[PDB]
Design a protein around this ligand. Sequence first.
Ligand SMILES: Cc1cc(-c2cc(NC(=O)c3ccc(CN4CCN(C)CC4)cc3)[nH]n2)ccc1N
Length: 303
Amino acid sequence: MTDYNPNYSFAGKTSSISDLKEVPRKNITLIRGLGHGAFGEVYEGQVSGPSPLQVAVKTLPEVCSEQDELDFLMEALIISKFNHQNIVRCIGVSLQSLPRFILLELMAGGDLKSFLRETRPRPSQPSSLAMLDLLHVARDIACGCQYLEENHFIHRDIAARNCLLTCPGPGRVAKIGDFGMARDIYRAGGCAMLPVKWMPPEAFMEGIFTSKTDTWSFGVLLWEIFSLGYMPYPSKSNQEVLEFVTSGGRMDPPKNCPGPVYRIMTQCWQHQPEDRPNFAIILERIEYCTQDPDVINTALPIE
Ligand SMILES: Cc1cc(-c2cc(NC(=O)c3ccc(CN4CCN(C)CC4)cc3)[nH]n2)ccc1N
């Protein structure tokens, strides 16, 4: 990490490893493993100087290559330089002890896909979620995407699995947490691991990426949200989706999805990038849906 010592640039400023805030290892205590390993080897932790700071701790297995090490460092740099409420904060790092740690804002609600799946309405918990909850999650992530767009950062992998919630209950805030794809790109894995079902046509055809490619992905995220955590294009394979979407195919509305919300999805999925909304427009249309009583009084389906 010191032998290659990569620099990272965001918003015109250049940073290096030496700019990360090193937290002494003795101040860090691991409490428990977290989640099913979506975001990697992640633990709930405590940082103290009492009233200790609660954190997520991402670890780097010591049995990783020197390039995994570099990926890890770059991931830390990227997330440390963001400054927005809908992007997970980086508390600091602990790189001078092994295994290496990145310290992250603790998102007690877990990842958005799992949350949607586990908090689906069911006969026992009839009103676990409401349409307004979903629109608020959508707004939250759109707000983070707008921040990235304004700072000319293309995320390349906007998807529910890469978003997290602060807490499970009312008052939850959704945030973008994973930046691995953008990391891999900034440092450039294989064809079968690409997020095909979240990618626009010109991503395949020409490999051209812009903020309008995040707009497309956000449309798919909206479908994930309002379907309550379903896999996009259910029962289609990656190559089937690639051929479907290229030929103009689009997903049907999620069950009970209000028309005004589905129309945001279809606008996000315009074949021509220039016909897709930027995230300021997406935010406007989400807000409009939020104001519409017929939208927010639509009942979600029961599982
Ligand atoms: C690498 C990385 C990790 C994180 C991160 C992860 C967490 N949190 C959890 O992984 C978690 C999982 C599962 C639960 C448990 N469930 C139980 C019931 N659920 C309905 C909700 C939460 C809680 C937290 N906070 N921050 C953020 C950014 C980055 N780059």
